[PDB]
């Protein structure tokens, strides 16, 4: 248990705490300006001149003094209440507030011993910000106290609410830009309070950083009427409180006392909600939120060159852009740094004075030290059930290609038992698709968590105010909740229709970037559990939907995060349920990855046993010898290679036909896609020798690929024999139609695969047979048109091993 | 002018109109069930049996009777008020409501003559829905009256509000799923009413289709308290009205009269707002919105197999899934179809009776016929200014590589004058980045349109309640507004930081799919203007930001929509401002495309004259002979090829060094990326002969690519000499740093490009020189570390032609 969660003070904030908060705010403002502007001389010792100013002024001042103000008050609150707290910096371009916070709390020097608490350390701290060989502009994973960089705006609230799930002692004050709140993902993020429970989860306090402006415009929320703004927050289930400061001559000590009093009222309300929830955990409370309305750039010069800067979008990036080049900008910068009176904040040796930090929290309550902001220090491996009990044993009892299994049901049973064994640290998210993607065996041990109105057991099934599945029709919510759940040390999976995974392409990019920086150069940030995404209801079998639901292209995006041997991204094609099981075990053990797990949910053959699945997965691609009819690679006339359940089924049927014609071939299944890249691009891929062994040195290879052929073509560009691969992938064809028709129109069906294999082998010799196969595809299509279902010869085919 | 816009009735809805609306609702419900369930016998003529039921039951009943109800009332409103109207079907899986609407209004038979108004036509209409060789499950572009398919949910409101921009006579009732409203893009879509003007734009009426459920869950909005729901809509600037029906025994005629009365109150309020806006166009009104709360699946069987179906998520997809296989489901289906009393709705010949449609609008007011729902019939070519006046003439006067131009400023001036010449049909959208991406010369002739509070001319600049630029910090808004603006026949452009274009990857996918279906098989849907996206502030020069802002990967997504010779996607690399001008002219003339226009906004050399730009763009890739020093291709030791402003600059400097060493090479610039594909994949690409002429038959080619190397590798897979290309692209390296450092760490800098060219030519011979270049890159990096700016030898280099 960290601290004493949810305790009220029952006395006023002390005057010593007010004095310390004002010094915090002045020293963090001063050092934020130092990080942006100063390459040397951080205490302005004589002579302080333009030569001390950075040659390239980069950074964002506008948000920063508002963040520094809130962080003074959040620090005071954590110390007085001993409250387990992680904050979210929505405007993550306010990096200097976050580095300053860590430098003040002592964690920065603890993690970065060269950046010491004295004048030499402070000089290095100023220079390094946004500087070559230094540190980032944003609140990056290398900053103690960050679980959210806030570079690509919009995810502040999903991360805040995922952090508090199953974390009942955790308080998250979530600072949201008012520009940020105009994004789609942030606007739906407010609604998360219908999906958390005040007893079993922790508490988010949204703080709208309503500074009136984004980059070059006012914000929507800052210019609507007060009555609309309050109605908006009340309508989303909050009790809105509003603070307004900095727009008149009120002295800063008075402002601190008024804010401290308000923040105590708000926290007392949060403690009352927490206490009440021990008895009534079914009534959704109106959680407080805070409208924090202060001038953008607060405390910078009001006008610069006759233009209003404090209280304007003009304060957004770097005021006084000429501070190094003109004595006029320099004199302004000097007056501004001096206005904080650093001679009262730092000792002669350059260390921040003790009376600046006596009010601060200590130990693991510090924002920089709390282990929820470095959740791999809290993370424990899952207690996983034995995989063998889930195996589809039909392959062993009856043969390769047996049965009509819906593959994700086996993952569902495995998930059900993982939740049983790990009942408060493994969650499933879904955008109203958990049952549709066949993971609903989980409901046998838990419910979907819904903290909003109930009506009747005639409609409400498998839903309760607490549970370990969460659904909302938003891929951004599901991805953001899960990411923060992992970042705070827990585990999970989500599932999406494949075409709609693209809604969160950019979130996958940012989380991959977080992982890249971490595996490269942040070894104190310990490994977290991986994002596991079941990519299902795929391009080939969207029976009730049509062409909008046909886009397997998240493969292509994921390929753009496969560099430097970071190994933070995996693309797996689950050939059947036994393979899905073997892939899911590996993913649930893995850390510091995004794992995209492709599996069809339609009834489909099972090809491999679980033991075979375990070996083949490890290799990445495997010959299926029981399906090949060639002696050795020299006898092979063509290599039949597939990735994905549907291409494999069609390839298998084509193999059966090619066997009966007396054609010699081998069958290769590909599960771990990026293991096709060369060793030069991927030090864990198949070696050239293993790659040649599978694909031959010079035989043609027909490769039936689940997604866009482009992906495989680009991955295998420097591989031996790559000029002989003919990759058949999805090619933007299809509609609402029968299963045969969907493969037919992308040349993916068994008949077209058999034809392509014959064309690769000898086009002239097989000219007639190819015509005949192409005519059968027309006949089969006409059959479907006339009759309403596919031709029995297609649907009724079972691999001859069965 | 279509109809008589914004006219009140000032009498009650007639009883004849109520009777006609009830018959509409019954016949469209009946035919919706017919489309889902029936392969033959649409009038249930003796014998009606299981054999008439489809073998594959696919489709979505739950949303559909609510849509059919609203469409009866929207049709009545259009007819009585003669109101120019396009609706948006948010729940686009209710395709049968949209096809039924067109079949009733007569447009379906007008566009599809085989689907006649009689029993034979009705049989074909039922069978074809969601059927092989038939039509889609959703409200697809092939349905008259659609500008929004609603497959990937969330974009209903951005499309509605973009439709009404500069369209002051247009009314858009926008039907939003209540599941849909849990998405991010929909949640921010409500806020658009701060960005439209009630005088110069038309009016959206959001209708929340609050049927209580999504697929397998209730919805957030349906289960919060009524007071929260109303406060929510009032807080977003609406006057909420709520209708509740279908939950008790109220007869359907009574329900129609109550709704008609309410819908007249709402429309009268919209007419009052429109009238008032002729005098006060600065006060933002509270626009009506409608909460429409009815049971999901309304009018289907209340219970099926003991499970509540009407008023449940269970009604979502296909009730009575056994209707063909069991007499029990069949008897239920039969009673349900009979409950609509089709013997009163159709004549003996199977035509829908005249008294079913006497209340309907006629001519171009019909929802299926209105030209705003087929805007290429309204679209006129832009009156474009002459391009030559914008040319950067520095190249002609001083030489190739001259000056420090910020390329998008020339596009800004060109846009400024396009708006001048087309002052109400060309708009610019930006997610608070218009000025940041340097398109702010447009503000010389128009303002950013902002219909929310003003404070002071000290902060409000270039903003007014009407104008042709719109900004909101949401890529989903900018993309959705623009798409509908084009779909209703107008023109525009938007700009985004390149990394954040990924927020709307999935919207680009859907619009590409809309374009694919249209160019393939919908010739009555005439061409619309293209989506033009300035992709700027790119990976190499995000000076104030860092690694979160470094992701040029939208190239890779766009490559997945380049099939079948649809030619609906273009990727252009603007080498400099003259090239950007030549690309922008072509894009502004083009139709039925998405055009991604890559240009850097940093100060940069101009390489080509405008006449050269015009020729090279047409070819797609061009030798720059004035930069090559080889005689012919046989003399070439290496081909120096680049795409993108920054790779080209570095390649050019490498060429200068390689020239001074006595190395023989040619320079090739690539502008129109997909023209590198083979003719087999792209019938408008470079032929093999032209490709060999540029890239040689067998010399090494160093290709410095703006984005991920993977893209170029996969595109050129079947090209002559492709095994000799070495593609250098962005490889997930970089941070907040100097311009040299960002290229350095991706091996993209001039020194590394010169080294790679030497390695390709003779690794042994040049071993020492390569070491030396690699050491200079270290020295240059250390310089930046020590000094705060890049080494003068790097920054000060100008191409020797200047
Ligand atoms: C850094 C960057 O690229 C910023 S900061 C910013 C304004 C944010 O204003 P906000 O009111 O949220 O913050 P504050 O006033 O500074 O506190 C924008 C549009 N951008 C570009 C941008 C665009 N779109 C998205 C999704 N994310 C980002 N970061
Ligand atoms: C068709 C499909 O793939 C549907 S329909 C649906 C429920 C929509 O409920 P809503 O309340 O909006 O509509 P209604 O009750 O039927 O009127 C979902 C989750 N899906 C999957 C889905 C997921 N995510 C996104 C972005 N879009 C879609 N279409
Ligand atoms: Mg702001
Ligand atoms: Mg609904
Ligand atoms: Na090759």
């Amino acid at each position: 248990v960290i601290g004493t969660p949810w305790q009220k003070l029952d006395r006023p904030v002390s005057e010593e705490a007010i004095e310390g908060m004002d010094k915090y705010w002045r020293v963090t403002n001063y050092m934020s300006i130092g990080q942006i502007y100063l390459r040397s001389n951080p205490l302005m010792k004589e002579p302080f001149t333009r030569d001390d100013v950075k040659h390239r002024l980069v950074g964002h001042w506008g948000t920063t003094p508002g963040l520094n103000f809130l962080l003074a008050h959040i620090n005071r609150l954590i110390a007085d209440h001993q409250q387990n707290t992680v904050f979210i910096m929505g405007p993550g371009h306010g990096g200097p507030a976050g580095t300053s916070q860590s430098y003040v709390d002592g964690t920065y020097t603890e993690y970065y011993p060269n950046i010491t608490k004295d004048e030499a350390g402070l000089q290095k701290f100023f220079r390094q910000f946004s500087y070559p060989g230094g540190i980032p502009s944003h609140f990056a994973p290398e900053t103690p106290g960050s679980i959210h960089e806030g570079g690509e705006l919009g995810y502040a609230l999903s991360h805040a609410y995922g952090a508090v799930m199953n974390n009942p002692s955790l308080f998250v004050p979530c600072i949201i830009g008012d520009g940020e709140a105009e994004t789609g993902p942030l606007a739906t993020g407010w609604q998360s309070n219908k999906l958390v429970n005040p007893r079993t989860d922790g508490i988010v306090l949204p703080i709208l950083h309503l500074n009136g402006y984004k980059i070059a415009n006012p914000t929507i929320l800052a210019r609507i009427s007060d009555e609309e703004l309050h109605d908006f927050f009340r309508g989303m289930g909050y009790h809105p409180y509003e603070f307004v400061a900095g727009f008149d001559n009120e002295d800063h000590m008075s402002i601190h006392r008024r804010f401290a009093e308000l923040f105590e009222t708000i926290f007392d309300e949060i403690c009352d909600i927490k206490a009440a929830a021990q008895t009534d955990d079914m009534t959704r409370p109106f959680y407080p939120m805070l409208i924090f309305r202060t001038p953008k750039g607060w405390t910078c010069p009001k006008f610069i060159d006759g233009k209003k800067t404090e209280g304007s979008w003009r304060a957004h990036q770097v005021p006084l852009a000429s501070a190094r080049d003109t004595e006029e900008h320099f004199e302004v910068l000097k007056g501004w740094m001096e206005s904080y009176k650093p001679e009262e904040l730092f000792n002669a040796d350059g260390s921040i004075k003790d009376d600046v930090t006596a009010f601060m929290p200590k130990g693991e309550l510090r924002i920089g030290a709390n282990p929820n902001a470095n959740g791999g220090v809290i993370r424990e491996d899952l207690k996983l059930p034995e995989l063998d009990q889930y195996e589809v044993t039909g392959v062993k009892e009856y043969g390769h290609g047996w049965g009509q299994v819906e593959a994700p049901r086996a993952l569902g049973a495995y998930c059900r038992d993982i939740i049983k064994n790990n009942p408060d640290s493994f969650r499933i998210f879904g955008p109203d698709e958990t049952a549709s993607n066949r993971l609903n065996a989980t409901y046998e041990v838990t419910d979907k968590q819904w903290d909003n109105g109930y009506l009747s057991g005639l409609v409400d099934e498998h839903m309760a105010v607490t549970g370990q599945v969460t659904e909302q029709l938003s891929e951004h919510q599901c991805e953001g909740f899960l990411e923060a759940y992992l970042l705070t040390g827990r585990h999970g999976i989500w599932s999406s229709y494949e075409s709609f995974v693209h809604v969160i392409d950019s979130m996958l990019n940012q989380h991959a970037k977080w992982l890249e920086a971490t595996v490269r150069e942040i070894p104190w940030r310990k490994p977290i559990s991986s994002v596991n995404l079941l990519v299902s209801s795929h391009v080939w079998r969207q029976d009730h939907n049509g062409f909008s639901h046909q886009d397997p292209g998240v493969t292509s995006l994921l390929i753009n995060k496969t560099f430097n041997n970071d190994h933070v991204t995996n693309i797996y094609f689950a050939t059947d349920a036994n393979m899905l099981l073997a892939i899911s075990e590996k993913c649930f053990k893995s850390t510091n990855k995004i794992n995209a797990i492709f599996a069809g949910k339609q009834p489909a053959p099972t090809w491999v046993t679980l033991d075979e699945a375990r070996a083949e997965l490890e290799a990445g691609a495997a010959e299926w010898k029981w399906a090949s009819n060639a002696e050795n690679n020299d006898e092979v006339q063509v290599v039949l290679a597939s990735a994905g359940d549907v291409p494999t089924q069609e390839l298998m049927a084509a193999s059966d036909a090619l066997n009966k014609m007396g054609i010699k071939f081998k069958v290769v299944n590909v599960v771990d896609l990026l293991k096709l890249q060369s060793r030069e691009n991927n030090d864990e891929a198949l070696t050239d020798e293993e790659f040649t062994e599978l694909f031959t040195a010079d035989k043609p290879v027909l490769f039936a690929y689940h997604s866009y052929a482009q992906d495989v073509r680009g991955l295998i560009y420097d591989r031996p024999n790559h000029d002989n691969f003919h990759v058949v992938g999805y090619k933007e064809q299809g509609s609402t139609t029968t299963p045969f028709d969907m493969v037919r129109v992308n040349d993916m069906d068994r008949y077209a695969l058999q034809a392509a294999a014959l064309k690769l082998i000898d086009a002239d010799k097989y000219a007639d047979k190819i015509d005949e196969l192409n005519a059968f595809r027309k006949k089969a299509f006409q059959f479907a048109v006339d009759n309403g279902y596919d031709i029995p010869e297609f649907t009724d085919w079972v691999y001859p091993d069965v």
Side-chain angles (χ1 to χ4, degrees), chain A:
Chain A
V1 181
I2 296 159
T4 54
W6 317 121
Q7 292 302 305
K8 303 194 254 190
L9 282 202
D10 307 314
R11 51 154 181 102
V13 187
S14 72
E15 182 68 14
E16 295 59 28
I18 308 298
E19 288 168 355
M21 287 193 289
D22 196 41
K23 292 181 168 110
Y24 177 102
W25 190 34
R26 285 164 50 202
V27 78
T28 60
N29 284 344
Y30 180 84
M31 294 189 296
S32 291
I33 296 161
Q35 282 172 272
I36 296 165
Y37 289 90
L38 291 196
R39 64 165 358 250
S40 54
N41 201 357
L43 297 174
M44 302 188 290
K45 283 154 150 228
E46 160 77 30
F48 179 48
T49 73
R50 290 158 49 222
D51 192 55
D52 297 310
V53 178
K54 287 172 175 192
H55 286 88
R56 294 183 80 251
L57 292 168
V58 288
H60 293 84
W61 167 244
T63 194
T64 298
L67 298 183
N68 283 332
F69 182 94
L70 294 167
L71 286 167
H73 281 274
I74 290 157
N75 272 126
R76 197 284 309 170
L77 182 87
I78 287 171
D80 275 9
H81 295 263
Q82 298 287 288
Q83 177 54 53
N84 176 29
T85 300
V86 168
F87 88 109
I88 303 290
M89 191 186 291
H93 49 285
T99 60
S100 294
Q101 195 291 130
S102 177
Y103 190 72
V104 169
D105 77 17
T107 53
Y108 205 77
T109 299
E110 296 165 5
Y111 280 107
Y112 302 104
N114 181 49
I115 307 294
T116 41
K117 296 164 161 155
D118 55 15
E119 186 181 342
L122 187 75
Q123 179 277 321
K124 291 168 192 150
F125 181 73
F126 285 8
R127 180 189 298 187
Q128 69 167 14
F129 173 70
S130 287
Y131 187 90
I135 63 155
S137 51
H138 281 58
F139 194 41
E142 67 186 81
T143 322
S146 183
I147 58 162
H148 172 98
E149 181 173 39
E152 185 172 300
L153 301 171
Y155 314 109
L157 276 168
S158 58
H159 283 161
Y161 281 93
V164 307
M165 295 172 175
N166 299 295
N167 220 331
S169 71
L170 183 66
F171 174 50
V172 177
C174 171
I175 307 177
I176 295 156
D178 56 347
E180 173 174 29
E182 299 179 8
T183 70
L186 197 291
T188 193
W190 299 109
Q191 304 287 23
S192 307
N193 59 4
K194 269 73 67 184
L195 293 180
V196 287
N197 182 270
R199 183 170 62 73
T200 53
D201 301 321
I203 298 285
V204 176
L205 173 67
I207 301 171
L208 181 59
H209 182 10
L210 190 67
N211 60 12
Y213 298 94
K214 39 187 190 286
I215 303 180
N217 283 289
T219 57
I220 289 181
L221 298 184
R223 301 280 188 99
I224 61 180
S225 63
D226 289 334
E227 304 48 39
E228 283 166 283
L229 186 63
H230 281 249
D231 268 356
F232 177 56
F233 293 117
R234 213 185 303 106
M236 292 194 295
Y238 295 93
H239 180 187
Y241 286 84
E242 175 166 3
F243 183 80
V244 181
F247 297 89
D248 56 16
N249 299 128
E250 190 181 359
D251 68 277
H252 291 174
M253 303 286 286
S254 300
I255 295 176
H256 292 297
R257 299 193 193 92
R258 289 195 304 115
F259 192 76
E261 181 162 320
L262 174 65
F263 209 47
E264 289 289 310
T265 295
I266 279 167
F267 200 72
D268 281 350
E269 180 165 8
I270 286 177
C271 295
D272 286 347
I273 282 162
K274 268 283 178 179
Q278 308 311 306
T279 304
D280 177 349
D281 61 31
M282 301 171 171
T283 304
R284 174 170 51 90
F286 281 77
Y287 298 92
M289 67 76 60
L290 173 65
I291 296 159
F292 177 68
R293 188 184 303 259
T294 63
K296 191 158 172 164
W298 195 8
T299 70
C300 75
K302 284 189 170 46
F303 286 83
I304 295 170
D305 293 324
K307 308 287 196 172
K308 183 165 158 65
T309 300
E310 196 203 36
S312 175
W313 51 273
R314 280 191 162 96
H316 182 72
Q317 199 148 248
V318 176
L320 304 167
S322 304
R324 189 181 170 93
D325 309 314
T326 62
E327 60 177 349
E328 301 57 42
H329 280 206
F330 181 74
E331 285 308 314
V332 179
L333 174 69
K334 188 184 147 170
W336 177 18
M337 296 191 81
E338 274 169 359
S339 67
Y340 302 101
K341 294 175 167 171
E343 69 289 353
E344 314 180 336
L345 301 176
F346 293 101
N347 291 302
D349 69 356
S351 55
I352 289 176
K353 290 195 205 252
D354 291 348
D355 73 1
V356 178
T357 64
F359 80 100
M360 291 282 289
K362 282 132 98 149
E364 61 172 2
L365 286 174
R366 287 171 298 166
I367 279 170
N370 190 295
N372 283 279
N374 185 2
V377 318
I378 299 186
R379 182 189 169 285
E380 288 170 0
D381 286 343
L382 285 160
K383 292 152 167 139
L384 295 171
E386 293 295 294
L387 249 204
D388 309 272
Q389 66 191 297
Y390 305 105
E391 178 174 20
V392 175
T393 59
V395 179
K396 269 183 149 139
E397 300 165 81
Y398 310 113
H400 299 295
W402 177 82
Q404 282 293 269
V405 162
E406 298 171 328
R409 297 194 181 270
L411 170 67
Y414 180 42
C415 286
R416 174 196 61 215
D417 293 342
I418 287 171
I419 289 167
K420 197 177 217 257
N421 290 353
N422 306 266
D424 76 353
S425 59
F426 186 87
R427 287 183 80 77
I428 295 157
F429 301 87
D432 186 38
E433 281 170 19
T434 295
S436 185
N437 296 152
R438 311 292 188 238
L439 296 174
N440 51 121
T442 56
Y443 301 166
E444 291 167 21
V445 300
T446 191
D447 290 299
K448 289 178 290 179
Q449 178 164 287
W450 177 252
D451 282 76
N452 195 15
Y454 286 77
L455 289 180
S456 173
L458 296 189
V459 297
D460 296 323
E461 279 171 15
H462 309 299
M463 22 178 248
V465 297
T466 53
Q468 292 302 285
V469 180
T470 286
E471 305 223 288
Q472 176 174 344
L473 207 178
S474 170
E475 295 77 4
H476 292 107
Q477 292 279 89
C478 290
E479 174 72 24
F481 281 159
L482 177 62
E483 290 170 5
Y485 199 64
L486 299 169
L487 289 151
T488 48
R490 284 69 66 71
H491 305 272
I493 182 168
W494 74 285
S495 76
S496 171
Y497 293 4
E498 176 175 80
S499 52
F500 309 141
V501 166
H502 285 282
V503 173
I504 47 75
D505 284 346
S506 67
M507 293 185 83
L508 296 174
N509 290 342
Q510 298 306 332
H511 191 67
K513 286 174 173 299
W514 176 276
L515 289 175
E516 292 170 339
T518 296
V519 300
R520 299 165 185 184
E521 44 204 280
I522 318 170
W524 59 261
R525 187 169 285 283
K526 297 292 197 216
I528 60 163
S529 308
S530 287
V531 171
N532 303 309
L533 171 55
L534 178 69
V535 185
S536 193
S537 298
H538 55 52
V539 59
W540 309 109
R541 286 297 308 271
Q542 269 291 352
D543 296 1
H544 288 79
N545 300 311
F547 191 59
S548 58
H549 290 51
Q550 292 172 195
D551 195 317
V554 69
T555 57
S556 321
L557 242 303
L558 288 164
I559 292 166
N560 296 341
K561 293 291 173 295
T562 53
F563 291 104
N564 196 54
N565 293 316
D566 292 327
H567 303 312
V568 295
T569 310
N570 298 293
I571 298 163
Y572 299 112
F573 292 95
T575 311
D576 58 38
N578 285 333
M579 195 73 70
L580 179 54
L581 291 164
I583 282 153
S584 289
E585 187 182 69
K586 182 180 183 151
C587 290
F588 290 149
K589 295 178 160 161
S590 76
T591 55
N592 289 341
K593 286 154 178 73
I594 295 163
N595 289 318
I597 308 159
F598 296 68
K601 69 144 179 222
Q602 83 283 356
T606 308
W607 294 108
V608 306
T609 64
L610 185 53
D611 288 335
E612 281 153 14
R614 293 200 262 228
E616 286 170 28
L617 167 62
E618 167 78 311
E623 184 178 354
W624 281 347
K625 281 175 156 65
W626 49 269
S628 310
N629 66 4
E631 271 344 348
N632 53 63
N633 285 354
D634 279 312
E635 197 180 26
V636 172
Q637 301 185 258
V638 65
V639 183
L640 300 182
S642 67
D645 53 310
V646 157
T648 295
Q649 187 178 20
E650 293 312 302
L651 189 90
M652 288 288 105
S655 89
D656 180 17
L658 286 158
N659 183 50
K660 291 164 153 85
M661 286 181 76
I663 299 280
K664 263 56 238 278
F665 59 77
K666 63 180 319 188
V667 181
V668 175
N669 186 59
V670 175
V671 171
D672 185 346
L673 190 74
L674 291 169
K675 280 188 177 181
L676 309 182
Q677 291 178 101
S678 66
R679 307 276 298 206
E680 211 204 328
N681 290 303
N682 175 2
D683 80 3
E684 288 171 1
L686 288 163
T687 50
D688 280 359
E689 139 172 66
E690 283 159 333
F691 190 93
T692 298
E693 170 64 19
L694 285 175
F695 291 108
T696 85
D698 68 349
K699 296 339 174 37
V701 178
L702 178 60
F703 195 115
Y705 177 52
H706 177 80
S707 176
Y708 294 94
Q710 165 84 1
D711 288 348
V712 172
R713 301 170 185 157
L715 284 179
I716 64 167
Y717 81 106
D718 59 348
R719 287 294 213 169
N721 203 22
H722 67 269
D723 279 358
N724 269 311
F725 271 66
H726 172 56
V727 183
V728 178
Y730 179 66
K731 44 181 211 181
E732 285 297 306
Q733 296 283 344
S735 185
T736 302
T737 188
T738 59
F740 165 73
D741 195 33
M742 271 302 311
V743 280
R744 174 188 80 103
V745 292
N746 294 278
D747 290 343
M748 179 66 70
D749 64 85
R750 51 199 71 171
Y751 315 110
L753 288 179
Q754 177 185 180
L758 301 175
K759 179 157 337 204
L760 285 176
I761 293 175
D762 194 337
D764 294 334
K765 177 173 222 264
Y766 291 111
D768 287 5
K769 185 60 178 190
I770 285 167
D771 289 357
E772 190 173 320
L773 287 165
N774 287 334
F776 189 82
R777 281 168 79 214
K778 266 64 205 283
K779 165 174 147 92
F781 175 56
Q782 192 55 54
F783 185 99
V785 176
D786 294 344
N787 293 284
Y789 60 96
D790 280 319
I791 199 163
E793 170 157 15
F794 177 87
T795 65
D796 289 349
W797 178 82
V798 183
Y799 187 74
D801 200 50
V802 174

